[PDB]
């Protein structure tokens, strides 16, 4: 009933209010996320957007939340979609 996240100082507080929510397959999302934080933080810095992935759903699903301005949200969404398509194909 509670989730914690680290918000970098350079991310404005005004852009945590209108997130983008989408759903994918957990079987993709597990290897999508991986384990470590290095390239996750690097991608977040490059896109100027914050990414959050949760798996507490009906059992096999992936809840993805993307923060930031619409251009950044679009960039992160395309990155995720293209890389997921390449993984599945």
């Amino acid at each position: 009933s509670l989730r914690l996240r680290t918000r970098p100082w350079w991310f404005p507080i005004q852009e945590v209010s209108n997130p983008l929510v989408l759903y994918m397959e957990a079987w993709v999302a597990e290897r999508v996320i991986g384990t470590d934080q290095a390239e996750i933080s690097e991608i977040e810095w490059m896109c100027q957007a914050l990414l959050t992935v949760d798996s507490v759903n009906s059992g096999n699903l992936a809840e993805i939340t993307i923060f930031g301005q619409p251009s950044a949200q679009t960039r992160m969404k395309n990155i995720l979609l293209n890389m997921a398509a390449w993984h599945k194909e």
Partner: peptide, 13 residues
């Protein structure tokens, strides 16, 4: 030099 922890609400589902 603070560290910001953002806590979220219930869920989206």
């Amino acid at each position: 030099s603070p560290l910001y922890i953002l806590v979220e609400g219930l869920s989206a589902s």
